[PDB]
Amino acid sequence: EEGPQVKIREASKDNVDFILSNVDLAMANSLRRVMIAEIPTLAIDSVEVETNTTVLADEFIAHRLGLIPLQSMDIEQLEYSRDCFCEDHCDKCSVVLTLQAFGESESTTNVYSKDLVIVSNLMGRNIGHPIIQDKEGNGVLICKLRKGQELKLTCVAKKGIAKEHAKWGPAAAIEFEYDPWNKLKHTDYWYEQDSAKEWPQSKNCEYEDPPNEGDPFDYKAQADTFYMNVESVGSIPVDQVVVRGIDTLQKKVASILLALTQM
Amino acid sequence: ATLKYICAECSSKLSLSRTDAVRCKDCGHRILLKARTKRLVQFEAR
Amino acid sequence: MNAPDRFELFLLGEGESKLKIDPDTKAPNAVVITFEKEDHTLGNLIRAELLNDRKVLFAAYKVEHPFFARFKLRIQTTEGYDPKDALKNACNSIINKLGALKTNFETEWNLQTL
Amino acid sequence: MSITETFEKPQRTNTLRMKHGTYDKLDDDGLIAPGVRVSGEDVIIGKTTPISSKRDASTPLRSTENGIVDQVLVTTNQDGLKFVKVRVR
Amino acid sequence: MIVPVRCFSCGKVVGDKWESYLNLLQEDELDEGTALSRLGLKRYCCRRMILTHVDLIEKFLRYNP
């Protein structure tokens, strides 16, 4: 469809190995950054503690709670508490969850994210459900209880972005490469005896043609063909991380044309 | 049912006033811990 | 204590606008725009596109200090061509560019098994 | 002789000797309780001394510190002295 | 104290792989490297997270109060 062109290699619920082509390096990057820092997500951002006789400190536990990825599929149908017209938090802008655990058995009792319970009204939007990907539906190991110890908390999920705190980040890592065959000569290989023999040839050298011995340096070639791979953390479907990445970037520029306008 | 103090060891919820020195029931642990607050604390999840 | 709130990176405080347009004096047909609450993500972008325009004589950006979220964009264009327009142009040109990318992707997504 | 010190909330009388930190956080036993968030120059231990009515003896939190009370311990020495150890986290 | 929830460097969820890792070692008699790769921890930033953790909580739980 004339313009930037995707060409997927691998795909699963977690990764999306692909090849962007026919685009400016600047755009590949801005998109690369946006995915890492500005895609909205839901995450625990307030913990009220009724009882903690655990071996850990409240803020210690609270910190982990926020790191627990939550369902953020329909995150757009949720508003930022700062915009919402209520007083603090409400179903229109927040998801409330609870954690009650007691060391009943004499064996060490584990507390997982599965043990979290939504208490607010999700009004039909897939949101706030603690993500689970392990082979036993346990989720993240929040704490451990000895017999007799207790943990009664009250969380409050809210919409956020990585720029504010890395807990709200939907991305895990983002592979990024170009010109696997150092033809644009963007880098100068450090070596002891042989540049070529000492530096491992990358995956993507296969998807390209090695330059020819006698060709004079191509001084007009630019940087197109970027080999990326996005890893989602679960709060959102991989395909989405990318898509919404392009979306937010799009809305950003839009917020600017609208600035010149009402300017 | 309330409890102003706890005991360093038997965990038994003690609670007495002045002239009561500092001992628990059977656990003469002259220690005693001050018991948490009911005024629930909020925490930034950051 | 001295650390500013993190939301101040993307939220315009009070009295601030997303853009402050000022006329450059050193040269003709030159403008300096100040983007508040934005970083390299938009900066290098609008810069790169602005450079694909031939009637554009100058385009560069810079965030003077990492502590604050704002960058400056200076554009110089051919007589008759308003810099403010080149920006609008670069923007739209970008927005379109992405829309296409968005599609192509959602398209290739479906053709995948898993 | 007939002159001690007491761990309790003070409320100015004849001497008024006290300090800028607020005592609102203390309990009537003169000690804050675990869970209470403290900061500024707040008072952690309320104490008083009648030197020949109330002269404020008390421990305010370190000026450049501020956390949450983690544990208050009340004990006795070998001379039967009332002891107090406030740990802030 | 306990398994950090995520990899400090990239964000990968890791707090849900501690017990599995422990089993991969005991009941399956595998080695840490092979064990870690099977849990999907491919980049060293994520590998070090698990391979270097020290579960001191299992010692804290041993105190009575």
Ligand SMILES: [Zn+2]
């Ligand atoms: Zn609300």
Ligand SMILES: [Zn+2]
């Ligand atoms: Zn006792």
Ligand SMILES: [Zn+2]
């Ligand atoms: Zn990592």
